[PDB]
Design a protein around this ligand. Sequence first.
Ligand SMILES: OC[C@H]1O[C@H](O)[C@H](O)[C@@H](O)[C@@H]1O
Ligand SMILES: [Ca+2]
Ligand SMILES: [Ca+2]
Ligand SMILES: [Ca+2]
Ligand SMILES: [Ca+2]
Ligand SMILES: [Ca+2]
Ligand SMILES: [Ca+2]
Ligand SMILES: [Ca+2]
Ligand SMILES: [Ca+2]
Length: 188
Amino acid sequence: AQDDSTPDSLFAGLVGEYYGTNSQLNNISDFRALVDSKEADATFEAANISYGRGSSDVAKGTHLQEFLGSDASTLSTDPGDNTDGGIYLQGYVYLEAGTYNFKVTADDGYEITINGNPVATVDNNQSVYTVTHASFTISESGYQAIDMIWWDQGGDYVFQPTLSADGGSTYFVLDSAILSSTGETPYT
Ligand SMILES: OC[C@H]1O[C@H](O)[C@H](O)[C@@H](O)[C@@H]1O
Ligand SMILES: [Ca+2]
Ligand SMILES: [Ca+2]
Ligand SMILES: [Ca+2]
Ligand SMILES: [Ca+2]
Ligand SMILES: [Ca+2]
Ligand SMILES: [Ca+2]
Ligand SMILES: [Ca+2]
Ligand SMILES: [Ca+2]
């Protein structure tokens, strides 16, 4: 819902913020502290949340643009170089009541929360790895609150958090089919 005096862009995606740093990101706490510490280095619309893979540091050169791919055209600016960096995504996802689980491929770590509760967590650095996470329930059909953080401490980078509604038999990428920046229905 609206919570201030600023109209918010309605689009079929999550609100994305990118933050870079020249300090080391070791874990979720480090990245959240970076987000806390300053304004985003860039904003974007996260409409197709399947990013990377690439090499030679996400925070260098045009690597962020390459990583974000189809979403990069919504960047507010081209950040300068940093050694480390990551993204913070927030908004809504349409889910019917039922049981779900994430399966996430990433380098480095990440955390996804739904309706305030963590549902997929890797609290450390790692080369590319895919985790099938534990199932969670959605009690009421509709737009659920969702946020994500992901970061790269350096080197390679990838982030693809897929979701299953059928007990792990099939998984889908979160994209414009079901994402909403504000919780209103997007017609874009
Ligand atoms: O230790 C974690 C690191 O392992 C390797 O260096 C990977 O290339 C790098 O992307 C990852 O961040
Ligand atoms: Ca607002
Ligand atoms: Ca901030
Ligand atoms: Ca750049
Ligand atoms: Ca891509
Ligand atoms: Ca685009
Ligand atoms: Ca680093
Ligand atoms: Ca990395
Ligand atoms: Ca399958």
